[PDB]
């Protein structure tokens, strides 16, 4: 059947994540009706018992679309630089006895705060995505994405920045995702507008 009761249903990640190697912030939600499973099965090949593997970290206030894929397990035992990509070490067969372990880690996959990931996007092992970034639907993200950068395609590539450099710097500095709730609640209208600078000047006089 289905983890989700409605197409329009978006459940917070911190109510469906079971894998100790997945670390999630508040409010970030996964919208998964079209692919059936909860968030855990978005995160592929991530051993939940091992402390020595690439981990997945997701900030707060993320929007994650249906069927998005986060690839873990690094090269999954396959070494293209070796004579064979075939994972002899992992096929239990008396003849593959002296095989070396091909498994190479790629680094953690870190998703910043306020990231919107489109439906069926695929994030490759070890990539870092900056706060406020947008990943177009069906993207295959193979390298790091800068804060507030919009990328898309396969492999994914620069489309544009959401805002000026000044505004990006103002956002990274004010880190509204970390405000007291009180402040957050007060600022809902500004957050639903394009007035980065007015929000910034305001925060400045309250906070500095």
């Amino acid at each position: 059947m289905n983890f989700f009761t409605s197409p329009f249903s978006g459940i917070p990640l911190d109510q469906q994540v079971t894998n100790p190697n997945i670390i999630v912030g508040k409010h970030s939600y996964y919208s998964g009706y079209y692919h059936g499973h909860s968030f855990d099965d978005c995160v592929r090949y991530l051993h939940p018992e091992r402390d020595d593997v690439d981990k997945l970290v997701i900030g707060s206030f993320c929007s994650i679309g249906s069927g998005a894929v986060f690839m873990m397990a690094g090269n999954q035992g396959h070494r293209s630089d070796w004579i064979s990509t075939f994972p002899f070490f992992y096929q239990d067969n008396d003849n593959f006895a002296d095989a070396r372990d091909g498994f190479t880690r790629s680094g953690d996959t870190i998703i910043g705060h306020d990231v919107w990931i489109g439906t069926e996007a695929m994030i490759m092992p070890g990539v870092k995505i900056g706060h406020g970034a947008i990943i177009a639907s069906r993207s295959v993200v193979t390298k790091d994405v800068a804060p507030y950068e919009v990328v898309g395609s396969n492999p994914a590539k620069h489309i544009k920045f959401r805002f000026s450099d000044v505004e990006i710097a103002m956002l990274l500095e004010m880190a509204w995702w970390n405000w007291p709730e009180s402040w957050l609640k007060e600022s809902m209208q500004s957050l639903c507008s394009s007035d980065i600078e007015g929000l910034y000047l305001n925060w400045q006089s309250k906070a500095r």
Copy 2:
């Protein structure tokens, strides 16, 4: 699974249930490899609301397995707002003053005799002209002209199916709208490359 076999292609009008999905006759979906009927091809389309973007598909379309039609516009996310988090749609009292981020994209309109390859994705608001071909796994972000072939992600121009004049002749004769009797009689001609023939034959019958 909703399809009895891999080769099983059921007409859209035998399976659509969403009032906001409008479909021609003959158009079929072969969705065996993705289990669900065609309704679930059409993502985020409210069936009750008369004020949201619609999906309109014409006659004689061939829609491949797990093709996707994205509705609901930006789905409440505003890239030009400070945050794309859809506060207005989240169940939280701290989000009471949020404004509504939803923006419609316009309707998605697929014309007649359009073939859409398996697992291709159609973005909100795109118009795809008559006789167009959308390659498998295409991500269709902009309108497709009549008899155009496009592919890739984002989908880009590959080819036209025919010359400008042939396209014109086909757009004028509009076989998909002929009386049923003419259609049955045109069967061998339609399974042919002979635009000019059929066109001249049509002219003497219809003008």
Copy 3:
């Protein structure tokens, strides 16, 4: 329910293929947990009962990622060069009675030995993939692929070769996938190395 018991489960192809028109070499495996189904449903539209359709041939020691797609049945009855792409012939309506059969074969799909196919890659009908090739995840493979070539993207495009032209000459020549299993057992450390030249010299003498 799911064919595979764990995400880390990889079942050999030869233990899960029931379709006579799929020919699979030894040790090749499909790691299919995330798409639930056995390999048979990776292979799309291959009529099991007939001998006049395109077939799938896969070499030994291949590694196939979850949800890889092998498109069979050529043009599926749709003729872009014809007036309509609508498959009249294949639909039941008395009005389509005199339709011509639009089906056309594409040739076999042939994956060589030692091929790694990334998750959710799509191999188009009739393509040939050379030994030791790597197909990136989400590739849409519309053209043939050279031995030891790495491709990715949609449509797939040349990224690079894994080895020099000489080293590729040597591997094609020594074809270690055909060695008796006894030899392989002695060669494991060499196969988990970048030493093509070393093993080559070891093979001839």
